């Protein structure tokens, strides 16, 4: 469903403690590719209603988890299936590829 926003605090709830899948985009305002991909991230997440809890994590404001996971370059779109991580996409992508990539993990 539509992509939410997270930070260190909320991430715990919205991601680690999630029931349904999650798609967290580690972004930042300086991250040009992240910004132009974000609409794509959202609309795809809209298509994947109910299950795909899409979200956006500000990497500058929430470096914490980025450091824990080992992330720096962004966009870094991590996938979770139920609390725990499953996959991760890095860099800009064409929507068709994103869609397919999501589908093979979800449906």
Catalytic annotation, residues: 31, 34
- What gap in Å lies between CA 48 and CA 90, rounded to an integer? 20
Query: What b/e readout covers 23-36, taking b as 16+ CB neighbours within 10 angstroms?
Result: bbbbbbeebeebee
């Amino acid at each position: 469903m539509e992509a939410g926003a997270v930070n260190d605090d909320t991430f715990k709830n919205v991601v680690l403690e999630s029931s349904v899948p999650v798609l967290v985009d580690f972004w930042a305002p300086w991250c040009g590719p992240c910004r132009i991909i974000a609409p794509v991230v959202d609309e795809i997440a809209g298509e994947y209603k109910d299950k795909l809890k899409c979200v956006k994590l500000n990497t500058d404001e929430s470096p914490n988890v980025a450091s824990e996971y080992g992330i720096r370059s962004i966009p870094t779109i991590m996938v979770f299936k139920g609390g725990k991580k499953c996959e991760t996409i890095i860099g800009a992508v064409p929507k068709a590829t994103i869609v397919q990539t999501v589908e093979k993990y979800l449906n």
